[PDB]
């Protein structure tokens, strides 16, 4: 029967801290049940850059029990004060529709 | 939060018609919009599914092969092609969002089919 | 596939009274329910989902409870604009059901 959906975790889930220009990593991990499917979605501050160049485009699956996994990757390679937000994901499988959120910070100094 | 419909209305068996539903106030490309009828003095028919980018779509056994879901998320608007109509297809119709449940619903427009 | 069925058909209630409604499933849907509400010309509204989860702005004397195939709805106390019909929901497998509906009018 299913066609439900878990839950969707981000990761890092905290203290998103980055020094203007940093590599920034998330992992939105959309957890569904076997016969479903899952659109992301990506919510951001910054209007620079497109949708295809900083979330991935790769099939990330896996499965197992009675459940499985899909997961997208927002990758923002050098920030600027502009970047500065709240970054939001939304999977999306017809049926029913979950999202999450994080906030990553921008500080105005250099990296190591 | 809100969705505003359009068209619907009279119509011949094996015509066609075309109903809009405009999104507003949220981030109309992230969640999935769905389609619901309800015929006079009946419980609610659900119809139809779609996904935020258009890459999922189910139909209700019914209306499978007849009637054709899709969106333009840069219009914010879900649309519903109607074809080859029945006069059991006489209902009012309903858009609706879906976070995990139907939250969001459009005000309903009303398509009648009779030759 | 599935079948939602509501009981009673219809209930009469006055200002002040606990309303309660039940819906049964054929099948096992764990706690994956909805519960709407309806008024003569108007689109349905969400109340319930989840089992017992409100919607943001549905009023907390409207309440849930149930899992597997049965399923309760309960009023703990009735108003003015009570009075209208409600619904059960269910989103386990597709396509999503809908109950029959339970029609909350004025008692005499």
């Known amino acids: 029967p299913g066609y439900r959906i878990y839950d969707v975790v981000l990761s890092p889930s905290h203290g998103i801290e980055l020094s203007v220009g940093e590599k920034l990593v998330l992992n939105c991990t959309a957890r569904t049940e076997l016969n479903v499917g899952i659109d992301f979605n990506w919510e951001y501050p910054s209007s620079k850059h497109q949708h295809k160049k900083l979330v991935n485009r790769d099939l990330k699956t896996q499965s197992g029990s009675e459940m499985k996994k899909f997961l997208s990757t927002l990758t923002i390679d050098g920030v600027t004060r502009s970047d500065q937000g709240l970054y939001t994901c939304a999977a999306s499988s017809g049926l029913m529709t979950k999202k999450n959120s994080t906030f990553v910070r921008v500080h105005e100094k250099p990296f190591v | 939060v809100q969705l505003v419909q359009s068209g619907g209305g009279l119509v011949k068996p094996g015509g066609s018609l075309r109903l809009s539903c405009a999104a507003s106030?949220?981030?109309?490309?992230?969640?999935?919009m769905n389609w619901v009828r309800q015929a006079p003095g009946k419980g609610l028919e659900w119809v139809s599914s779609?996904?935020?980018?258009?890459?999922?779509?189910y139909y209700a056994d019914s209306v499978k092969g007849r009637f054709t879901i899709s969106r333009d998320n840069a219009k914010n608007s879900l649309y519903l092609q109607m074809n080859s109509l029945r006069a059991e297809d006489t209902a009012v119709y309903y858009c609706?969002?879906?976070?995990?449940?139907?939250?969001?619903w459009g005000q309903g427009t009303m398509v009648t089919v009779s030759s | 596939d599935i079948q939602m069925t509501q009981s009673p058909s219809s209930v009469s209630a006055s200002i002040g009274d606990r309303v309660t409604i039940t819906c049964r499933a054929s099948?096992?849907?764990?706690?994956?329910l909805g519960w709407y509400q309806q008024k003569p010309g108007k689109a349905p509204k969400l109340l319930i989902y989840?089992?017992?989860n409100l919607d943001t702005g549905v009023p907390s004397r409207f309440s849930g409870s149930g899992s597997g195939t049965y399923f309760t709805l309960t009023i703990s106390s009735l108003q003015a604009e009570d009075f209208a019909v409600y619904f059960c929901?269910?989103?386990?497998?597709?396509?999503?059901?809908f109950g029959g509906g339970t029609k909350v009018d004025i008692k005499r």
């Open positions: 779609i996904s935020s980018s258009s890459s999922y779509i």
């Open positions: 099948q096992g849907i764990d706690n994956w």
């Open positions: 609706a969002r879906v976070t995990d449940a139907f939250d969001i």
């Open positions: 989840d089992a017992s």
């Open positions: 106030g949220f981030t109309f490309s992230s969640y999935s």
């Open positions: 929901q269910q989103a386990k497998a597709f396509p999503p059901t």
